[PDB]
Structures are given as structure tokens and as C-alpha cells.
């Protein structure tokens, strides 16, 4: 499901070592949508509760550019540049000190990609319902969801077919998970109506690196899915 999301209120997603990432990741999208499906008792909730399901792949929200295409990551850096057009990064983070609380927030108004993929007919009605909900009443990503930070309304919704990358020469669009990886990817898995919190920290490989690997792992999928690692045709 290809789409364009526009932020009217900005978002704040933190990382470790006092960094905040440029773009909202697909793990945040997933967590928001699974909350939203919980609030509407949609039949897929239990599956968003599971961190393993790979049928629905919520990719990462990547900043679209003036080109209209998707900005692509750059190895050994903290920015993304439309190969089509000469950069997104380290100029949209904005330092915020609010009644004691000091954090960082990525400024609003920029347009990001809403590209999810659905490999079964079991959800087209369900996703439809979630995009319809995201359309009429918005979605929220990041911190301070109940304070209105992270407002994200749709700007475009197209149900357009998708096909895997018929290339073993693939560039990592986002942070893949490998057993001996160097970038520690940290995320979390709450459990509402159970009061359970956990911080999932797993090693893996960073984005913007070309991988010469004949596996091809379906469409992207590096191994976590549910966000995590993506790939693009080089």
C-alpha cells in the first residue's frame, strides 16, 4: 500500500547515546497501528502483539524528497539524499526544553513514505480499515502520543501491487538484524492489558550498505521483520 503521510505536529523518537533518528521507523508505525487495531478490536490485533509475524510488512517511513521519490540512506553518515536529486539530516532535529524536560523533536511539515506490503488476502480489509482510520482521524508516532506529538495524516493512499527484488545485489534500506552485527538495534514490545514492558536489544547491520548475498529473503527482510531491515535494488 503506497502512500504519503504528512506531519502537522512533529515527532520525537529517541535512540541511545543521546541520539534521535531523522525519520520515523516502521516499528513505531507498527506499534501505533497495533494499538489502533486494539482500540477497534480488529481480528489481527493478536498478530501485531506477536513480534514474529511477517505476512504484513510495515517498512520504514522514509522521507520523500522534492523529487517526489524516496530519500535513500548513505553509509557511514546520519543523512539520506535522493539519488535523483542532491540531503535530509541533522537540520530537522530541534532541541526542546519544556518545563524542565529536555529532549529533541524532528520538525513537522515534511512528507514521509507510507509503504506497507500485504502478502495475503487475510488483511486487505483490515489494512483498508486501518488506512481509513489513519485518514479520517490521523496516526501518532513517537513520544508524547497523548500530548499530541507525532500527528501524521495521510496525503495519498494507493493500493498498488508489489514484487520482490529479483537481484542478489541489494542495498540495505534500513537496519538489518544479523547474529554478529555491529549496530545494536534497540526497540521495545509493550503488552497492553497485561502491564508488561521489555527493551529488545539485538545486534545487526546498519543501513546504506550493499550486500552481495544470494539469499534475497523474500522481499527485503534482511531477519526480524515487523520493520527492522529492508533492501532496495542496486
Amino acid at each position: 500500500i503506497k502512500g504519503i503521510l504528512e506531519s502537522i505536529t512533529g515527532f520525537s523518537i529517541p535512540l541511545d547515546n543521546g541520539e534521535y533518528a531523522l525519520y520515523p521507523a516502521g516499528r513505531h508505525l507498527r506499534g501505533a497501528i497495533g494499538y489502533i487495531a486494539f482500540n477497534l478490536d480488529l481480528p489481527i490485533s493478536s498478530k501485531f502483539l506477536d513480534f514474529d509475524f511477517d505476512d504484513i510488512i510495515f517498512r520504514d517511513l522514509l522521507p520523500i524528497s522534492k523529487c517526489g521519490k524516496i530519500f535513500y540512506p548513505e553509509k557511514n553518515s546520519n543523512s539520506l539524499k535522493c539519488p535523483s536529486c542532491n540531503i535530509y539530516g541533522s537540520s530537522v532535529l530541534r532541541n526542546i526544553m519544556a518545563r524542565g524536560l529536555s529532549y529533541k523533536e524532528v520538525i513537522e511539515g515534511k512528507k514521509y513514505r507510507l509503504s506497507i506490503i500485504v502478502k495475503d488476502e487475510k488483511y486487505l480489509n483490515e489494512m483498508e480499515a486501518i488506512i481509513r482510520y489513519i485518514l479520517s482521524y490521523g496516526i501518532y508516532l513517537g513520544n508524547k502520543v497523548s500530548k499530541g506529538y507525532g500527528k501524521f495524516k495521510i496525503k495519498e493512499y494507493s493500493i498498488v501491487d508489489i514484487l520482490p527484488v529479483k537481484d542478489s545485489e541489494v542495498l540495505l534500506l534500513s537496519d538489518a538484524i544479523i547474529d554478529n552485527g555491529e549496530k545494536d538495534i534497540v526497540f521495545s514490545k509493550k503488552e497492553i492489558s497485561s502491564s508488561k514492558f521489555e527493551i529488545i536489544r539485538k545486534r545487526g547491520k546498519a543501513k546504506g550498505d550493499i550486500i552481495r548475498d544470494n539469499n534475497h529473503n523474500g522481499f527485503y527482510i534482511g531477519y526480524g521483520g515487523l520493520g527492522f531491515g529492508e533492501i532496495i535494488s542496486l
Binding site: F38, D41, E108, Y140, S146, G148, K151
Partner: protein
């Protein structure tokens, strides 16, 4: 969870409103001209903290009427902890920011504030702050999940308390006096 309440709250300013600009880089960029810039988007619309104001309104009102409501360190057993969130459990009332409908150039006006000596009747200090004009209509969409029965009553009670006291900053000078219009709804189905 099968029922969800969306409280659509529009606002029109009756007094000039000031809420402080919160981001350090845009504050410092505006501090060459404006000593108190107003809170603005990158799309040039005024953002207003709304959750804390409604929360504070419930804590003074329910402390006065005698409910066991914590003073914000939450409690987790009070109904303000059920509405706007404890430290463990999340809040049923997810409150949006009170975004402006119009743009900065139409509703935000730079202005002069003074400090006047009390024996010479002359201006000792002079500074500039940006304020939002009156008649500027603002909207927010308060979401209450797992809606209890007395949620809309509590929200409108807080809303009338904000009309009584004000929202934003400089509330004792007269700023932030606003009027509120609410339209509710319920959300189910696909």
C-alpha cells in the same frame, strides 16, 4: 475495546493569548527580535499544550470537590490517572495539541510589554513578545479510549475551567482567556 470517543474541541481566543516558544533553535533565531516568541510549527501554525492544562484543571477541581486525586509523581488509582495517565498505565484521554486554523502572518503579532517605575511613572524596562490575536479559531481532537460514562462531563468541566482561568502563559496579566466549543462522537465499525 469496541467504543472510542473523539471529542472535537474548537477554541476562539477572547483575550490575546501567549504560549511560549519551546524549541531552542527557533527561540534563539527569534530572540534577536522577539524576547518571548510564541509556539509555532514549521508550517507556521500555533501549537498549544492542552493535555497538561486539562489535567491541571481536573486536579484542582477534584481536589476541591474532595476526590482522591493526586497532585502533579502520579498515583495510578485516581480518575485523573485513568484519564490522562499514570506512570505505569497509559492514559485513556490522548489529547491533541490545539493547532491553529490560520497561519502565523494572520494571527501572530509582535508586541511591546513594559515595566514601569512606581515613583517616576516611566518605563524602566521594555521587551517584545509575540501573541495570538482574538478570534483566531483553534482545533484539537481529544481521544478518550475505553470511555467511562463521566468522561465528556469531566472534559467539559475542565474546558469551562480553562475558559475561567486561561490557557498558555501570562495568565495573571489577562492572557489566554478563551471560549470553547465541543462536538462529540463515537467510533466503531470498519
Amino acid at each position: 475495546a469496541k467504543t472510542m470517543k473523539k471529542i472535537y474541541v474548537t477554541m476562539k481566543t477572547l483575550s490575546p493569548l501567549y504560549t511560549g516558544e519551546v524549541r531552542r533553535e527557533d527561540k534563539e533565531a527569534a530572540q534577536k527580535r522577539v524576547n518571548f516568541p510564541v509556539r509555532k510549527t514549521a508550517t507556521n501554525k500555533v501549537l498549544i499544550p492542552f493535555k497538561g492544562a486539562l489535567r491541571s484543571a481536573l486536579e484542582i477541581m477534584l481536589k476541591a470537590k474532595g476526590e482522591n486525586v493526586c497532585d502533579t509523581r502520579p498515583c495510578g488509582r485516581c480518575v485523573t490517572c485513568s484519564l490522562f495517565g499514570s506512570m505505569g498505565r497509559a492514559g485513556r484521554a490522548s489529547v491533541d495539541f490545539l493547532i491553529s486554523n490560520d497561519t502565523k502572518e494572520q494571527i501572530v503579532r509582535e508586541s511591546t510589554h513594559l515595566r514601569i517605575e512606581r515613583q517616576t511613572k516611566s518605563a524602566s524596562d521594555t521587551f517584545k513578545g509575540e501573541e495570538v490575536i482574538e478570534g483566531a479559531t483553534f482545533t484539537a481532537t481529544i481521544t478518550i479510549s475505553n470511555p467511562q460514562e463521566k468522561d465528556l462531563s469531566l472534559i467539559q468541566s475542565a474546558l469551562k475551567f480553562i475558559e475561567e482561568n486561561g490557557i498558555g502563559g501570562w495568565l495573571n496579566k489577562g492572557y489566554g482567556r478563551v471560549s470553547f466549543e465541543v462536538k462529540s462522537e463515537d467510533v466503531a465499525t470498519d
